[PDB]
């Protein structure tokens, strides 16, 4: 029986995270059920942090991200965390009411987001193809994260601070005994006052264990692909291009191109693969969108984007069982939200307010708390 103040169950971007803010002040040990941290969806993401992108109170959190990312504290990483990719979303459908709507939302939060006309954006991104675009949307302000660097710098910190992080650990049994939480594994059994479920797409599932009523999470699927440009074109520095709709992405990536239809579907929480019709879907319609040529892509994936019914993330206690906090419901944002949320989460966790950065980005607790949720 091993002993913590936090418990975390998940080593993705949220359990990393958490585990990281907590870890200054408290021992903190991390159960994770595969072999490595990252295998299910914070290995699976296309890496891009965009602030007018999800709900309100997503933008919230990934705009309060920023100030770590950009300068995380000495020993963190050895390189930067984000790396330039503005983004573009054009308007291939004719739709100039939505067009407008999209812009000045995004401008009001992004001062510097401009409206493009089609010949900007075709000089920007030059396999458009024109007779398609009838405007865009840029943003200067995006960035690629380098998720790798991002999420051993927040493990590799636990560990400094005397924490663990558990690997080939899956917590099998939960149970609330003499005012602790006690797990059990196959690996050994762990106790501590606070639980924290940061176990993704699986976070009912960590509740129903638990005997907590859960938040409703739904996983969907999204999948993504890697193909390879013209080899007489220079494609490393385009944005981030999105559709107006979302119906698909492309970005550069390593000399390669990744693409994805962008897919939301479904599923319950798994080991999830690729399907053949979502990667045929997004090679389709980057082809009416562009002159580009997809050969079989050379690696295709898919990973769960895991949501609740208003679309914003989860960060808070359980009502009516002590000791039980949720870090849920990243949905398609956890990693661009990870800094600040796990900034707020380990306030939370401790009883503390949130810090004065996070308040001023107006996030306040309710917002993020578990209650606002079921009747
Ligand atoms: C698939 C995917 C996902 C994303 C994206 C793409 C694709 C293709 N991107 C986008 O399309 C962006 C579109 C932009 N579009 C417009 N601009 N217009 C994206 C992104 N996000 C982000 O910011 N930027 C991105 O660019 N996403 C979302 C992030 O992928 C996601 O939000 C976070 O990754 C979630 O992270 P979490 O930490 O919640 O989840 P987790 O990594 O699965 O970890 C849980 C751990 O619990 C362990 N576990 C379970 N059960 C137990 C147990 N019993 N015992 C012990 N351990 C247990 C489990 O084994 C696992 O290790």
Redesign the pocket.
């Given at each position: 029986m091993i002993e913590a103040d936090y418990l975390v169950?998940?080593?993705?971007?949220?359990?990393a995270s958490t585990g990281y803010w907590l870890s200054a002040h408290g021992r903190v040990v991390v159960?994770?059920?595969?072999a490595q941290?990252?295998?299910?969806?914070?290995?699976?993401?296309?890496?891009?942090?965009?602030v007018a992108?999800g709900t309100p109170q997503v933008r919230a959190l990934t705009a309060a991200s920023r100030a770590f990312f950009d300068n995380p504290p000495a020993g963190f990483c050895e390189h930067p965390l984000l790396s330039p990719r503005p983004?573009m979303?054009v308007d291939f459908s004719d739709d100039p009411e939505e067009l407008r709507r999209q812009y000045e939302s995004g401008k009001a939060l992004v001062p510097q987001m401009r409206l493009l006309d089609a010949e900007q954006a075709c000089s920007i991104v030059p396999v458009l193809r024109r007779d398609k675009v009838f405007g865009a949307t840029y943003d200067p302000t995006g960035a690629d994260?380098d998720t790798d660097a991002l999420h051993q710098g927040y493990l590799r910190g636990i560990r400094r601070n005397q924490g663990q992080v558990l690997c080939n650990?899956?917590?099998?049994e939960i149970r609330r005994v003499d005012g602790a939480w006690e797990v059990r594994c196959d690996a050994g059994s762990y106790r501590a006052a606070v639980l924290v479920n940061?176990?993704?797409?699986?976070c009912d599932?960590?509740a129903g264990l638990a005997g907590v009523r859960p938040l409703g999470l739904q996983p969907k699927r999204?999948?993504?692909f890697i193909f390879a440009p013209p080899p007489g074109i220079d494609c490393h520095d385009w944005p981030?291009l999105?559709s107006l709709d979302?119906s698909f992405?492309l970005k550069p990536d390593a000399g390669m191109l990744l693409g994805?239809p962008?897919n939301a579907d479904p599923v319950e929480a798994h080991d999830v693969q690729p399907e053949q019709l979502d990667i045929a879907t997004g090679m389709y319609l980057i082809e009416e969108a562009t002159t580009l040529t997809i050969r079989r892509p050379e690696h295709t994936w898919?990973?769960?984007?895991?949501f609740v019914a208003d679309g914003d993330l989860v960060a808070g206690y359980a009502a009516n069982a002590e000791g039980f906090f949720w870090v849920a419901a990243?949905?398609?944002?956890?990693?661009?939200?990870s800094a600040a949320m796990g900034e707020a989460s380990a306030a939370l966790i401790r009883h503390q307010p949130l810090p004065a950065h996070l308040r001023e980005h107006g996030l306040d607790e309710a917002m993020l708390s578990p209650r606002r949720l079921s009747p």
């Open positions: 169950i998940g080593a993705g971007i949220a359990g159960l994770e059920r595969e941290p990252g295998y299910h969806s914070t290995g699976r993401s296309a890496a891009h942090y965009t992108y983004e979303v994260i650990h899956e917590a099998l940061a176990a993704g797409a699986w599932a960590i999204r999948s993504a981030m999105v979302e992405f994805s962008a898919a990973g769960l984007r895991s990243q949905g398609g944002y956890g990693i661009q939200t």
